[PDB]
C-alpha cells in the first residue's frame, strides 16, 4: 500500500484510526440508535436470546475483547467471559446457557481462534458471530453473523486501528443489546454520542504528539516497565505494554492495578518505570502510597489522567494531562497515547516497526 | 515459631507440603469419597443448587483458583470465573444464576477480598464459601461455609503451602460436586487416588532438590524471565514467575503457551531464559519452533516435564525430568520445583526469602 506522507504503515495507521472509526460507525448509526440491520432479519431474535457472551481471540485482539468484557456487563448487564483462543481450544469446558461465540481477529485467519469457532460449532452455543477486518476470511465465512470493523487494510505487523475499530464495534454490540434487553435507553445514547465524538476527539489528541515524544525519551533506554490499570482500562494497560513489547523490545508488562502490592512491587526502580492509564482519585493515592515505598530507589509513577481530575505532579509521579473525554470510550482513547508512545520509542532505537522481529501478521499455521 | 532445621520459614513451610496436604485431607476422605460433611447437613443442598462458581482472591491465592476453574470445568462440568478481588469491588457485574461465591485467603484478611465479599452478599449469590488458613479471620467468619486448609501456620512472606493446601481443598470440592451432579464416580476416584498420593509424590521430589540447585545458578544472575504453561498448567506458570519476582527481585512474567509468538517472542535472547511447565509433545513441539526462531538470539528453553514423554535436551531445549504424575494433580505436584527454584535463586543472591523488599504477608488495610 502507500504510506503517503508517513514513514512507517503503522504509523499512518495510528494516524488513520478517526477515519477508521468514522468508517466502522458508517450506516450503522440511524437516528442516534446503533443500526445492525446488515446482520439480517433473524439477528435480533437471536440476539434477545442470548444471556452469556463468550470471546475467543488471540494477540492484540484478545486485549480489546478483554475491554468489552465490563462493558457487556456493567453496561448491557450480561455475562461475558474472554479467552485466548489457544486457551479454549486444548480445555474441555462448560458451555453457558444460551451463549453467543463472537470471535475477534483482524486477519480473520489466526489458526487458533479458527480451531476455537470450530470447535464451538460441537459444543452447544447459540451461534457465532465474527469481528473482523478482512472480509471472505475464514472467520467470517465460517461464522453465523459477522460484523466488519472497515479500518481498511492494516500493513504494520502490530494491530493499531484494527484494535480501536473492534472496540468501536463492540460498544456499538453492547448498545443494540441493551437495547433489546429493555434496558434504559440512556445507555445506548451515551454509547452513541461517546462514538460520534471519538473520531474528532483522537484527532485532536494526535495534534498533542509531543508530551509523547518527551516521555519516549525517558523509556528509550529502559529495559522494563511497569504498565497499571483498573477495570476497563487494564485491558488498555495490557495493549500498552504488548505494543511496547512489540515495537520497542522493551520488557514491559501490564499488572491489574489492584495488585501491584501483591508481587510487582518488589522490583521497581528507576529501571522499570510505572504507567497508570487514567485513574480515578482513590486509585492513584493508592499508587502514589505505593510509589513512595520505593523512593529509596527512583521508583516513578508516569499516569496519563483527565486534567480534570486535577492531579499535580510531584518529583516522582508525572501527571500528563489528557482532555476530559466521554467515559464510555475512554479505554478507546486511551489506547493512543500508548500506541504512540511505543511507536516513538521504536522510532528512538531505530527498530524494525514495520515488521519487529520475531512476530508475524497473523499465525495462520499450526 | 520454630525454625528447626531450616534456614527460613519460607523453606520449612515448602518442606512441610506433604504434611500439610496429608492435613487437609484428614477427615475429608471417607471409605474412598470426599467427605465434606463438616459445612453441615444443609450443605449439599445449597451445593447441589450451584449452576456457576464465582473466585475471588489476590496474589498467590488469585493463582489457585485460576488452577481450579480448569478442574471445575473439564472434571464437575460446572462453569467457573476468576476474578482479582480488586477488579471485582470496583466494578458493576453481571452476577450469573445460582452462583456459588467462594473467596481464597490464606490470611482471612485481606481488605480486597473481604471486599469482594461483603459486595457480593448485595448481588444475588446463592451463598458463600471462604476457603482459608487462619481460623476465625474475617473472610471465614462472614462467609456461609469455610473450608480450612489446616497447613499450619505460614509465616513466610510468599505463600508456599497456603498455595498447595487451596488446590487440595479446591480439588476435594470438585470431586464433592461431580458427585452431587451424578457424574461419574471415577472422576472423584481418580482425585481421591491423586490427593492420597500426593504428600509421597512430593517428599519424593523434595529429596531431588539438586537439579533445582543447577538452574538456580543458571537464573541468578539474570534480570527476567518467561514462564510458559498451558491450560491448568497455565495458572502454574503465573505462579512460578511470581515467586521469581518476589524472593529474587527477578523480572519473571508468566504467559500463556499458545501466546509466546504474539508479543513476548520478540523479547527473548540469552538474557530472558523461557521455562516451560509440563507441556505435552504437541506444545512442545510448537514451543521448539518458537525458540529456534530466536537461536541467534541464543534463547533457551527449560522444561520442567514428565519423564515419560521421552523429551531430549538439546543445546537450546533443557528437559528437567520429573517422575511421571496422576494428571489430576500435575498442577500441585509441578508448583513444587518452581518453588524451590525462586528460593534457591534467592538464596544464592542473598535476599531476604522470609520477608522480601516493599511487600507484606496481608494486605489488610485499603
Ligand atoms: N502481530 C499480530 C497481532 O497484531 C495480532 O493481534 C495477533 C492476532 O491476529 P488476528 O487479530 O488477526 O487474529 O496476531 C499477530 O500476533
Ligand atoms: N504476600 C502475600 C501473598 O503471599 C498473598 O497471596 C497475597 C494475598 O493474601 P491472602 O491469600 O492472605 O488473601 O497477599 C500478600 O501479597
Ligand atoms: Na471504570
Ligand atoms: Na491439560
Known amino acids: 500500500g502507500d504510506k503517503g506522507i508517513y514513514r512507517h504503515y503503522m504509523q499512518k495507521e495510528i494516524y488513520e484510526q478517526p477515519n477508521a472509526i468514522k468508517n466502522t460507525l458508517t450506516g450503522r448509526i440511524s437516528h442516534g440508535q446503533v443500526d445492525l440491520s446488515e446482520l439480517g432479519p433473524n439477528a435480533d431474535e437471536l440476539l434477545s436470546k442470548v444471556e452469556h457472551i463468550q470471546i475467543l481471540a488471540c494477540g492484540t485482539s484478545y486485549n480489546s475483547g478483554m475491554v468489552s468484557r465490563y462493558w457487556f456487563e456493567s453496561l448491557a448487564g450480561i455475562p461475558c467471559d474472554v479467552e485466548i483462543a489457544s486457551e479454549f481450544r486444548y480445555r474441555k469446558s462448560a458451555v453457558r446457557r444460551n451463549s453467543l461465540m463472537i470471535t475477534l481477529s483482524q486477519s480473520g485467519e489466526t489458526a487458533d481462534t479458527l480451531a476455537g469457532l470450530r470447535l464451538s460449532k460441537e459444543l452447544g452455543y447459540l451461534g457465532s458471530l465474527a469481528i473482523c477486518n478482512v472480509p471472505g476470511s475464514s472467520l467470517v465465512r465460517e461464522s453465523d453473523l459477522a460484523l466488519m470493523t472497515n479500518a481498511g487494510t492494516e500493513i504494520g ?154 492531579f499535580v505532579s510531584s518529583d516522582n509521579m508525572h501527571i500528563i494531562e489528557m482532555p476530559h473525554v466521554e467515559e464510555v470510550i475512554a479505554p478507546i482513547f486511551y489506547t493512543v497515547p500508548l500506541q504512540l508512545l511505543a511507536y516513538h520509542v521504536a522510532l528512538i532505537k531505530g527498530t524494525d516497526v514495520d515488521q519487529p522481529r520475531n512476530l508475524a501478521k497473523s499465525v495462520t499455521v499450526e
Chains 1, 2 share one sequence.
Open 157 to 310: 505487523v502490530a494491530s493499531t486501528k484494527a484494535f480501536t475499530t473492534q472496540l468501536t464495534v463492540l460498544l456499538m454490540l453492547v448498545a443494540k443489546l441493551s437495547r433489546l434487553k429493555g434496558l434504559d435507553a440512556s445507555i445506548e445514547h451515551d454509547i452513541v454520542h461517546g462514538l460520534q465524538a471519538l473520531p474528532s476527539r483522537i484527532e485532536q489528541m494526535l495534534s498533542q504528539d509531543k508530551r509523547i515524544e518527551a516521555l519516549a525519551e525517558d523509556f528509550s533506554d529502559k529495559h522494563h516497565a511497569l504498565f497499571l490499570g483498573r477495570g476497563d482500562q487494564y485491558p488498555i494497560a495490557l495493549e500498552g505494554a504488548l505494543k511496547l513489547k512489540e515495537i520497542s523490545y522493551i520488557h514491559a508488562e501490564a499488572y491489574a492495578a489492584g495488585e501491584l502490592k501483591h508481587g510487582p512491587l518488589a522490583l521497581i526502580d528507576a529501571d522499570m518505570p510505572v504507567i497508570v492509564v487514567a485513574p480515578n482519585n482513590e486509585l492513584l493515592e493508592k499508587l502514589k502510597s505505593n510509589i513512595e515505598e520505593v523512593r529509596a530507589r527512583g521508583g516513578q509513577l508516569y499516569v496519563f489522567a483527565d486534567q480534570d481530575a486535577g
